[PDB]
Design a protein around this ligand. Structure first.
Ligand SMILES: Cc1ncc(COP(=O)(O)O)c(C=O)c1O
Ligand SMILES: Cc1ncc(COP(=O)(O)O)c(C=O)c1O
Ligand SMILES: [Cl-]
Lengths: 398, 398
């Protein structure tokens, strides 16, 4: 007896465990004070955009012709915006992109949606995610009419279990989603991992008579520490689509600006780029926000104070390790992956909750027995949280 | 078959008549000079935004906290933005909306997309459009997994042929799309047309045992001349979804800011609003652009100089009528609907194309024998085009 689409109703009515945890912390702040609530739940950028963002926005609003500034760009975005990104990427990675290899989008969620929508031709199409993973991939894959296949986590190094991956590749496999630097683990795939992946997928692509794409979800690319290198995947694998946004690099998550990069070395660039444009059109996208496209021209290479996040990583890692917790030291992103004190991460997160430590069970990310602790938080809160972490530890280790 | 989704391939590679006509005019401008080409093809806002827009953007970037200014909003948008709109609508129309009746979107294309995706539950679902109509409705309807049904135009008054509409309503009918003020006719539906529509749909909804919605595409609401009233549809029919954007009112088409309005008076507001939230999520939307949501709070009821468009309407109408063309005098939008000089509009537009006058055959809008002439153009170009229009007229009046 439902007038609306049931999947849409479910997708809009489903309560987010993480968001509820965030709102629970605000309710707890009212009772015990915000200084006494240790909220490591939601993964929102916490450092301000570099000053070039606000300075450039001010300049466009003051000096750029208002009709031209606020008008529709082409579907794929201004050629000047696309040209500036192609040239920045070539100077940084040694690639050979031009403006026409880019399609400007309204953030990474739009870029991913476009990729699955462009690549899905059948109800039985499968996209592979490597656990632990961003759960919203299932919504985007399902929204395109396809299905998600999870590769069990490499809990030793948080790279890829290639045996497990190879076993889940079949005739229905359209692509493999990778997120490096990673949400939730903070892992960074090495050149070796990227090369083995590329060799495996090239080999399986030939066996099935069809390209298996790499869908590279790269919004944390510049959120990497200690000189660790994030390899540019298009250089290793021909059939690679790159999804990027300025949500983390420039701290503009609410502004909705990113891209889909379609290399010339894909099986048929003209055809795939056409499907990307068509998918964008089908999803109700007309163009990326014009003000932000024009602003991005002057912000290539610019990032916020990334060392603020590194300092938080080191502080949290040092304190948790010193207490006795087993933390995976992350090379990128702003999430720390910590082993729960019991196999049941949900039961462990409840015990954490008893001391107002709001951490997230990794079961939903495809990783039971672990938790995700976001450190895009206030540095002083991390220090004030240590006695509560110590007390939580004591509950298990008397 | 094809490696990508073929339907997405075709959507991204098939050029529209209007776009292909605009490209032709640029090539022609290179050969004979832009002064010798009179382009009335594309319908993009030609007047600047009111100064409050740019002033507010400077203010927000200068004074508002950077992290909070550029951060993610809730999926439905800032409560302050939604509340300011709800209050504006109430003061203007006598309605009783609150913040929770609104969902902020990335333009009217997103608003429309969301409405169709929310409602569609079977492949054979039908959404009715009243010819002449915005051809992109077919794209949004098809992308939602539904079929578009056309009602032939009322070529006497560009209101609605109710017998024709009634005949096309059946068990699959999920909604009727209305667009007043209208692209491409410039018609404004009267209070009576809206009342007759509401009556018909109430009866047919009961007959089929399910609500049939009015999807009211409203981006031209304020582009209305001579004090003509545009009735607020939710006061006439309970099951009404309003899709709006600030693309035409504030001249921000490239910025991607609008909304979907879900009245409490729909059959079940909680269910429908949850479906709208679901569809937004499934379409890859996260939030409308933060900066612009924050800006919209201070721009309620603001518009650019709409009198500039009226002066072009009057000049074009009086000029073409004087020559001998039959023009439907539009009450809103910035498109003039003119009867072709022969039955074949395409053949007529080719004869116009001989004299470097670029006008759009109404066949693609579902209305053969007419043309759309966009007047969101330079005023002096309208004046300079008249000898060419008369020369075109003289080809048929021998
Ligand atoms: C792995 C991953 N991909 C994509 C996104 C979304 O980025 P955007 O704000 O550009 O949509 C996020 C944040 O939720 C993320 O953590
Ligand atoms: C009738 C009609 N509806 C919707 C739109 C889309 O407006 P927006 O750019 O806000 O998506 C347009 C303009 O292209 C239009 O003419
Ligand atoms: Cl159809």
């Amino acid at each position: 007896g439902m007038v609306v689409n049931e999947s849409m109703y479910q997708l809009g009515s489903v309560r987010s465990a993480i968001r509820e945890l965030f709102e629970y912390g605000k309710k707890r702040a009212a009772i015990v004070g915000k200084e006494n609530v240790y909220d490591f739940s939601i993964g929102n950028p916490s450092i301000p955009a570099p000053q070039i963002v606000n300075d450039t926005i001010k300049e466009l609003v003051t000096d750029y012709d208002s009709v031209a500034l606020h008008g529709y760009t082409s579907a794929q975005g201004d050629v000047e915006t696309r040209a500036a990104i192609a040239e920045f990427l070539n100077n940084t990675h040694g690639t050979h992109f031009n403006a026409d290899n880019l399609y400007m989008t309204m953030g990474a969620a739009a870029s991913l949606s476009i990729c699955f929508r462009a690549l899905t031709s059948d109800a039985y199409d499968e996209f592979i995610t490597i656990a632990p993973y961003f759960p919203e991939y299932k919504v985007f894959v399902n929204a395109a009419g396809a299905r998600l296949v999870e590769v069990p986590a490499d809990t030793e190094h948080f790279q890829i279990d290639f045996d497990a991956l190879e076993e889940r590749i079949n005739a229905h496999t359209r692509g493999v989603i990778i997120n490096s630097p990673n949400n939730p683990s903070g892992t960074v795939y090495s050149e070796e991992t990227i090369k083995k992946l590329s060799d495996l997928l090239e080999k399986k692509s030939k066996e099935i008579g069809r390209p298996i794409f790499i869908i590279a979800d790269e919004p944390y690319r510049e959120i990497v520490y200690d000189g660790i290198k994030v390899p540019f995947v298009t250089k290793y694998y021909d059939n690679t689509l790159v999804c990027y946004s300025y949500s983390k690099s420039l701290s503009l998550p609410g502004e909705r600006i990113g891209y889909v990069l379609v290399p010339d070395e894909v099986y048929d660039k003209a055809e795939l780029y056409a499907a990307v444009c068509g998918a964008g059109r089908a999803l109700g996208y007309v163009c990326a926000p014009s003000l932000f496209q024009k602003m991005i021209v002057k912000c290539q290479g610019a990032t916020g104070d990334i060392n603020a996040y590194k300092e938080n990583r080191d502080l949290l890692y040092e304190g948790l390790t010193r207490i006795g917790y087993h933390c995976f030291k992350p090379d990128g992103a702003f999430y720390m992956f910590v082993k729960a004190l019991e196999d049941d991460s949900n039961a462990f997160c409840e015990k954490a909750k008893e001391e107002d430590v709001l951490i997230v069970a990794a079961d939903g990310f495809g990783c039971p027995g672990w938790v995700r602790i976001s450190y895009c938080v206030d540095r002083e809160m991390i220090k004030h949280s240590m006695p509560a972490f110590e007390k939580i530890y004591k509950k298990y280790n008397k």
